[PDB]
Amino acid sequence: QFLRTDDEVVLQCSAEQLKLCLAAEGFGNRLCFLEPTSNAQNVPPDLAICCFTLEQSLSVRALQEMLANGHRTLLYGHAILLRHAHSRMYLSCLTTSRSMTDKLAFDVGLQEDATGEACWWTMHPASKQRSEGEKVRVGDDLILVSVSSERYLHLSTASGELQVDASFMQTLWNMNPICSCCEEGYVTGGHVLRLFHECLTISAQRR
Amino acid sequence: MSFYAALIDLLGRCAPEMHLIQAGKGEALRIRAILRSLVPLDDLVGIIS
Amino acid sequence: RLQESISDFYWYYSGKDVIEEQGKRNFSKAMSVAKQVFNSLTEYIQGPCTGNQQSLAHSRLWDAVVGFLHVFAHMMMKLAQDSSQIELLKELLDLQKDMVVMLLSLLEGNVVNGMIARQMVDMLVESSSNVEMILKFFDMFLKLKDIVGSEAFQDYVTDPRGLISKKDFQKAMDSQKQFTGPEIQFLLSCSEADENEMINFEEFANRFQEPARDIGFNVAVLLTNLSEHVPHDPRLRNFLEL
Amino acid sequence: CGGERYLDFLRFAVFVNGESVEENANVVVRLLIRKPECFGPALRGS
Amino acid sequence: ALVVVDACKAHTKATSFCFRVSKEKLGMGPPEIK
Numbered sequence A: 001q002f003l004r005t006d007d008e009v010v011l012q013c014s015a016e017q018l019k020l021c022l023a024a025e026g027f028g029n030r031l032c033f034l035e036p037t038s039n040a041q042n043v044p045p046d047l048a049i050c051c052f053t054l055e056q057s058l059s060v061r062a063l064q065e066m067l068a069n070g071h072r073t074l075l076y077g078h079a080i081l082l083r084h085a086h087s088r089m090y091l092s093c094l095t096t097s098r099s100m101t102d103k104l105a106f107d108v109g110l111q112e113d114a115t116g117e118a119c120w121w122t123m124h125p126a127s128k129q130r131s132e133g134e135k136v137r138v139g140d141d142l143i144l145v146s147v148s149s150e151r152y153l154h155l156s157t158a159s160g161e162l163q164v165d166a167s168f169m170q171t172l173w174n175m176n177p178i179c180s181c182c183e184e185g186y187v188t189g190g191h192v193l194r195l196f197h198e199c200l201t202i203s204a205q206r207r
Numbered sequence B: 001m002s003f004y005a006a007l008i009d010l011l012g013r014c015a016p017e018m019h020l021i022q023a024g025k026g027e028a029l030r031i032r033a034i035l036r037s038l039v040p041l042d043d044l045v046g047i048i049s
Numbered sequence C: 001r002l003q004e005s006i007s008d009f010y011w012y013y014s015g016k017d018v019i020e021e022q023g024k025r026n027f028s029k030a031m032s033v034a035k036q037v038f039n040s041l042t043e044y045i046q047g048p049c050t051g052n053q054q055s056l057a058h059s060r061l062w063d064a065v066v067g068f069l070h071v072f073a074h075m076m077m078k079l080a081q082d083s084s085q086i087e088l089l090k091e092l093l094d095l096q097k098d099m100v101v102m103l104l105s106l107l108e109g110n111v112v113n114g115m116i117a118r119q120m121v122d123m124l125v126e127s128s129s130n131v132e133m134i135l136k137f138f139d140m141f142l143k144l145k146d147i148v149g150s151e152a153f154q155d156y157v158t159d160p161r162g163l164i165s166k167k168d169f170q171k172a173m174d175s176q177k178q179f180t181g182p183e184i185q186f187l188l189s190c191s192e193a194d195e196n197e198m199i200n201f202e203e204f205a206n207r208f209q210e211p212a213r214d215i216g217f218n219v220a221v222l223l224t225n226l227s228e229h230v231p232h233d234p235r236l237r238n239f240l241e242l
Numbered sequence D: 001c002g003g004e005r006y007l008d009f010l011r012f013a014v015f016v017n018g019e020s021v022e023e024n025a026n027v028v029v030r031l032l033i034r035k036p037e038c039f040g041p042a043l044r045g046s
Numbered sequence E: 001a002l003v004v005v006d007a008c009k010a011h012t013k014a015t016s017f018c019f020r021v022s023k024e025k026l027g028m029g030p031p032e033i034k
Helices: A063-068 B003-012 B031-038 B041-048 C003-012 C021-044 C050-056 C062-075 C086-106 C122-126 C132-147 C166-175 C183-189 C201-206 C213-227 D007-011 D023-034
Strands: A020-023 A033-036 A052-059 A078-084 A090-092 A109-111 A152-156 A163-167
Touching: A033 A163, A052 A063, A052 C003, A078 A090, B003 D007, B031 D023, C003 C021, C003 C062, C021 C086, C062 C086, C062 C122, C062 C132, C086 C213, C132 C183, C132 C201, C132 C213, C166 C183
Parallel strands: none
Antiparallel strands: A020 A033, A052 A078, A090 A109, A152 A163
């Protein structure tokens, strides 16, 4: 009924309203792109590169000594390092920008090393519904701010099509958990396995 | 042309002092990071010329 | 709002070695109000008013004592490094007395296997890392006063004033091998050098025996009262042997 | 001309005797980037 | 899908497989399959 450290989670935005998310390529095209999952009945959405786990949730005063020199459930006003599941590297803000408008906004990417000057994200509530210090209920509208560049990660619209950016403009998001503490040696969704019985292959036109 | 001129000088004198850059205090070189990001350097050359 | 306030004050002083004067007095003001709010919390509960007993239990007290238990296992293991922090440590421990004496009265008068006692134990297993540190701290300074009275230390004192050198005391506690590996050098930093020839185990055995007495008393009253109320539980059996 | 009767006052708020104070210089630049309309319409996209 | 098919046009009605143990007329999950 809450969020939880070491949970595979997935970002979701909604803006011509649809259901969008954040997948990353990894090992080439480190700039993050966006994908829609509003149309599951006729087409599968490739969500297997869209899952993020949670590693650290600690207060915005606690990490300064960490930059100087296991289940902690998370609250608002904390700071979060979240990593990519498949490509194994961490999400981060960046320095350059491909905005091509001088719109004073960086663009997110991915980073290998966790030397956390810039790969930390802080949490914020939406309105006067909830407030600072309360816990994070499942399925909530959040606002994510970088610690370093102090921008909001927002959905860009006016530049033709739509993609993510990092500017001063509020944008709600979501958590929508897809996994938890699994059991010993069972099967769950999203995994990869074999199909013995001497197996079930496909060929090296290969249909 | 006096409003934008008197906007910059407070952004000028809110830049941190140089002896707080020899010490790498994370605010004093991230305040400079945001303040360098807002107005580019080449646009400053166009005004002074 | 007090808990994450003063824990934010701990992270600011996590780095440097000593605490100066103005930082000390601002921390004494910080808990003398927290002693009052605990004393006023337990008087809503002191008479067995079950209308308040199962109302605090559904509130947010449980993460409140968890954050308080996090600073308690780190302050006393940092304030035990200097002889001019002791009067603050003399008034930090009795605050910790005055929060478990609330925590006694929350579970009083209940049934043998109740739900309040069942949610009494999950903080102890959620904060299982840093309930050990206070439990170790009541072991190092209670095992010491039995070691320092034994006949083994008379095979190491040579000075007429009993000033055992630090190079000799390290092999001394290594000989009587009841201790562990890394703990015996933490005990070195708790003494005072005075040109390194002195540790003066007269005062060092009983400097901490006095103020840690009654706080060390009622933690035995907890782990008894949780045991003979909720028996056959594995996690509580993983506590009292420490 | 409304800003020139505001930003002159902020100029005396983060600067004394030729030295820049630091406890006030940090807190003023958090505010005026949380609301970008404090910058003019040339700073959003001219 | 009775062969493999393009992922850009694989409908739910086109392909929807389902694991059972036989064929009778028919939060975190419960731990069934091993």
